[PDB]
XYZ file of C-alpha atoms in Angstrom:
164
model
C 0.060 0.069 0.015
C 1.187 3.692 -0.649
C 0.167 7.272 0.207
C -2.105 7.561 -3.190
C -3.950 4.270 -2.323
C -4.330 5.088 1.308
C -5.790 8.382 0.563
C -7.883 7.342 -2.349
C -9.561 4.754 0.191
C -10.219 7.657 2.752
C -11.275 10.288 0.351
C -13.154 8.515 -2.547
C -13.602 9.667 -6.078
C -16.294 11.681 -7.371
C -16.245 13.121 -10.940
C -19.046 16.007 -9.995
C -18.912 18.766 -7.414
C -19.859 17.769 -4.213
C -19.946 18.731 -0.570
C -17.276 17.827 2.241
C -18.350 16.226 5.364
C -18.165 19.783 6.282
C -20.397 21.055 3.763
C -17.714 22.451 1.322
C -17.690 22.131 -2.256
C -15.174 19.527 -3.507
C -14.578 17.386 -6.420
C -12.291 14.322 -7.438
C -10.295 12.895 -4.836
C -11.016 15.246 -1.882
C -9.941 18.313 -3.686
C -11.500 21.278 -1.742
C -12.678 24.017 -4.395
C -13.816 26.644 -2.074
C -15.386 27.027 1.450
C -18.018 29.621 0.239
C -21.620 28.728 -0.181
C -22.013 29.441 -3.820
C -22.025 26.583 -6.183
C -21.271 29.283 -8.641
C -17.722 30.395 -6.662
C -16.954 26.633 -6.648
C -17.434 26.281 -10.463
C -15.296 29.116 -10.983
C -12.555 27.843 -8.910
C -13.099 24.514 -10.798
C -12.612 25.903 -13.984
C -9.582 27.795 -12.921
C -8.066 24.823 -11.618
C -8.354 22.590 -14.594
C -7.933 25.136 -17.407
C -11.133 24.718 -19.039
C -14.892 25.184 -18.874
C -16.062 22.093 -16.883
C -19.564 22.974 -15.935
C -18.962 21.283 -12.726
C -17.812 18.221 -14.156
C -14.201 16.517 -14.599
C -12.769 13.135 -15.950
C -10.805 10.547 -14.185
C -7.725 11.855 -15.672
C -8.259 15.513 -14.359
C -8.930 13.974 -11.006
C -5.727 12.224 -10.693
C -4.052 15.100 -11.872
C -5.330 17.257 -9.058
C -4.485 14.411 -6.914
C -0.895 14.346 -7.874
C -0.367 18.013 -7.258
C -2.652 17.656 -3.734
C -0.415 14.980 -2.350
C 3.024 16.802 -3.618
C 1.801 19.991 -2.052
C 0.921 18.108 1.427
C 4.469 16.560 1.571
C 6.355 19.966 0.419
C 4.038 21.669 3.085
C 5.456 19.098 5.815
C 9.100 19.639 4.585
C 8.591 23.638 4.935
C 7.220 23.535 8.230
C 9.046 24.072 11.463
C 7.072 21.940 13.577
C 5.970 19.239 10.928
C 9.478 18.922 9.654
C 11.148 17.332 12.706
C 8.163 14.844 13.285
C 8.442 13.578 9.742
C 12.116 13.132 9.547
C 11.949 11.035 12.710
C 9.278 8.879 11.612
C 9.357 5.497 9.370
C 8.025 5.121 5.953
C 4.227 3.876 6.971
C 3.971 6.741 10.005
C 5.129 9.262 7.559
C 2.219 8.324 5.423
C -0.401 8.843 8.347
C 1.054 12.379 8.756
C 0.635 12.931 5.275
C -2.976 11.845 5.450
C -3.875 14.087 8.206
C -2.146 17.236 6.458
C -4.074 16.429 3.074
C -7.368 16.336 5.329
C -7.002 19.285 7.749
C -3.916 21.386 6.392
C -0.515 22.281 7.630
C -1.788 24.539 10.116
C -4.432 22.461 11.519
C -1.998 19.340 12.202
C 0.812 21.734 13.507
C -1.635 22.652 16.120
C -1.613 19.018 17.604
C 1.417 19.903 19.553
C 0.979 17.191 22.248
C 0.537 14.410 20.016
C 3.376 15.606 17.721
C 5.619 15.644 20.978
C 4.761 12.137 21.679
C 4.900 10.856 18.096
C 8.444 12.327 17.815
C 9.340 10.401 21.108
C 7.862 7.158 19.531
C 5.193 6.627 22.351
C 2.765 5.116 19.934
C 0.097 4.069 22.439
C -0.045 7.404 24.440
C -0.129 9.505 21.060
C -3.006 7.472 19.954
C -4.962 8.173 23.046
C -4.098 11.787 22.667
C -5.115 12.394 18.967
C -8.303 10.567 19.673
C -9.096 13.585 22.121
C -10.127 16.127 19.303
C -12.856 17.493 17.121
C -11.058 15.613 14.189
C -11.906 12.118 15.777
C -15.244 13.124 16.675
C -16.272 14.453 13.492
C -14.880 11.513 11.223
C -14.032 8.824 13.683
C -13.945 6.094 11.188
C -10.882 7.722 9.181
C -9.393 9.123 12.109
C -9.387 5.741 13.802
C -7.788 4.272 10.668
C -4.876 6.836 10.823
C -4.501 6.553 14.465
C -4.098 2.572 14.359
C -1.350 3.433 11.578
C 0.416 5.354 13.980
C 0.131 3.101 16.852
C 1.042 -0.009 14.853
C 3.367 1.257 12.193
C 1.829 -1.028 9.415
C -1.182 -1.127 7.064
C -3.706 -3.473 8.582
C -6.543 -0.867 9.118
C -6.631 -0.565 5.158
C -6.312 -4.235 4.596
C -10.167 -4.756 5.677
C -10.893 -1.458 3.315
């Protein structure tokens, strides 16, 4: 399993504009278009993102391209972040994937605010950090996905995703 397959399991694939768990306008493989309430603002972002007139609809191909960009940007963001980089560097390949998934879902900023868990992750206190990560809006709002990611940090392997 790899980062793309893992995220693709968590996010899904929709070729028509849709709403987030959060109510936000999205398309493809979890690509947020706008946090604005108008479908029209969304459409516009969409066409800006793709370089064509899409009329709210994209191809598989366009979805994966956006996905390639998004993943690349998540990793580069982690690398640039003073709070994130040190943790990322300290982790093994599998756990690195779990951080990357959090970053993709919630942005650099959001994750960098998980101060205490980050600390425990750096320290390799897997069980403690899993307990701390669960005490969040993130877990309460998207418990099945949060639990998959959390198991991944706890175990260091891909079993939470085997099922799926």
